[PDB]
Amino acid sequence: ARFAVEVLRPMGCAVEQTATSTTVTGPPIGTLKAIPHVDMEPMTDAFLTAAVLAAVADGTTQITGIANQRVKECNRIAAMKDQLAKFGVQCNELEDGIEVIGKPYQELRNPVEGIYCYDDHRVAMSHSVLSTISPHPVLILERECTAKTWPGWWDILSQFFKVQLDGEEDPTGTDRSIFIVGMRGAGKSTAGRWMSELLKRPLVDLDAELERREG
Amino acid sequence: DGSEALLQPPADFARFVKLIAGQSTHLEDVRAKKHSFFVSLTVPNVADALDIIPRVVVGSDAVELRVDLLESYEPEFVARQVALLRAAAQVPIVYTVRTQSQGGKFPDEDYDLALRLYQTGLRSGVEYLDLEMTMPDHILQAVTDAKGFTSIIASHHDPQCKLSWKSGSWIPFYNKALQYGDVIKLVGVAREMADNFALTNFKAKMLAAHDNKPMIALNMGTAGKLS
Amino acid sequence: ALRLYQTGLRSGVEYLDLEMTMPDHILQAVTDAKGFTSIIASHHDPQCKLSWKSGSWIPFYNKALQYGDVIKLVGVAREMADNFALTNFKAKMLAAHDNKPMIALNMGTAGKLS
Amino acid sequence: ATDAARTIGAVNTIIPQTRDGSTTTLVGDNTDWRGMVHALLHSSGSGSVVQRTAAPRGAAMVVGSGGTARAAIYALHDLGFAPIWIVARSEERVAELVRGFDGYDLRRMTSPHQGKDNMPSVVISTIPATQPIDPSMREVIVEVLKHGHPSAEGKVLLEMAYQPPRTPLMTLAEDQGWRTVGGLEVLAAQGWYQFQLWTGITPLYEEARAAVMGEDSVE
């Protein structure tokens, strides 16, 4: 809940709060001031929402304190990296954070690729916000993945924010490690060797590795 | 021979490796061809007719080892027959255990052996394996789970002619074969020429409904030669 | 045509093929003087306006039935199924009228089976 | 065109490919080398250097400078022969006969002594039998055939010209104990492969062989 005060107001929003209510009026379209540095470990799950706002901001934004977002579901910090890349906005992957170089909204790239969400509710809904002002209509693959936290998000986007949404089709186990067993002298190594040559893959004697690993 | 280590990978073993590593395109290739065939061996021992194999395989896209027609059902014996055939034929193998109720020799009820024979096929890396839909569910599951890159031909034969193409009394078997097999094989009996028309019509309707699982559909008897 | 048809009949040909498309006054004249010649009443459908399943051949069958000793109907196959439908059609006609046999074909390579 | 026919620089086979929806595509392939390999592997006797040994098979030779010679090199490289000695008229035409092949170990033989410890086990002759051989090429060829104990070494000559059935060069090689494989034998193989590429059916080679000899054909 600290997102409103510690992110949006620095970004140029008029954030008014009471004890039990939060109202946010955003600044004129595409004039969001970038934030030089923000610690977001208290708002670990809200960095994706911050990232898309930074992508449309005036200047370079830097989010930190989100090491735990790598093994959360997908590599979320790298997900935002190369999904925003499709809008032509480069990010950088920091030790426990993400740097995002903002772009004027009118000259964003058209993500013809389509936005893959990694089946991550957070990723789908964050790019949902960006696609509100995009100069080109954005396709979001995996609509239904919002279900994890908010099934009716698309409903509310349509009902309250009056956003036109449309249905479209999605326009988009080999190489397993082989184990060889039996006993020494059986032709085990020769079969291994043959396979290595045939599949262009590395043979590894598990006895020899046990010797090298142990010393 | 004994001198295996000094050699470089034989075609025999390469064909084997190609399949188990998921690199076989045996099904795509066959299905991309307008007409395809596999030759059904009726020989009691592959070693004793090893000279004949390559001739017999001409024009076919695979060789069917009819395990039931072999002179022995010992897993070790059958494993050799498969390896000998792979080496000699150098084409895909169809590993078929046909039960006697469905026109073969293998006993219907002898399941313990059937399972072991089925696994001998899978372990040997055969490109196709034919399990009958009449087999109990616990074996259909076990063979399906360990199938690997073997293509399953889900089969049913109707030698006593209890089923019908037009009436749709095949559907229950089709439905079953659909979830178990990569290829459906339904075989009935023709009494008259019309019975081939009904089959052809049936097959067409099934392929329309499930494009992704191709079908081998035949009528036995001289009447059903057209099928 | 009439003169050619009579040249056939006069020559004592065992079979004579008159098309059902010919006008009635010639169908009558050739039928009346046919003698011991067997008449093959024919119709061909090269433009593929007719169909075996739908029974759009019946009007020609009905006509050929009363003029010919042998009916000859020839259509076009676009697909293999069109031969099945023909075979089924012929069988139904022979059941209904045993006494007048039929030559039934589909043209084109698709209709080779017919 | 296939990667074989591209690097060899010659197409003996045209294959249509039905690209359903699109128009038909025409592919160029080379089955000449394919046939030569097959002839050396199977059509030469058992106990041939090819049947006896495994890659790398050591040295081999290609006399002649034609477009056949191009394919002969490719064939020998596939069978794993290296170095591949070349005997030809001039260094001018041998240089353009090498052009394209890289890392094959092609080297000209102008004198017998150059082959010490690397004399060829297999020779592929692309010179015609109608033409007489050049004195300087003969001097090289003659000595290569006489070298060692060809009979027990299992050595093999492959004559590409099939008229007559037995050429003057084959006659000499046979006297020195070499196994000779005639041109018709390659013709069968070459074509056998074409048939496979067109039909998707691989009949037995004996069938194709017999068709070429006229022992079992339709005519």
UniProtKB/TrEMBL annotation, chain B:
It comes from the Eukaryota. It is found in: Cytoplasm. The active site is at 157 (proton acceptor), 185 (schiff-base intermediate with substrate). The AROM polypeptide catalyzes 5 consecutive enzymatic reactions in prechorismate polyaromatic amino acid biosynthesis. Homodimer. In the 3rd section; belongs to the shikimate kinase family. Belongs to the EPSP synthase family. This is Pentafunctional AROM polypeptide. The lineage of its organism: Eukaryota, Fungi, Dikarya, Ascomycota, Pezizomycotina. The chain holds residues 1023 to 1249 of 1581 of the full protein.
From TrEMBL, chain D:
It comes from the Eukaryota. Residues 183-213 form the SDH C-terminal domain. It is found in: Cytoplasm. Residues 1-219 are annotated as: Shikimate dehydrogenase. Homodimer. In the 3rd section; belongs to the shikimate kinase family. Belongs to the EPSP synthase family. The AROM polypeptide catalyzes 5 consecutive enzymatic reactions in prechorismate polyaromatic amino acid biosynthesis. This is Pentafunctional AROM polypeptide.
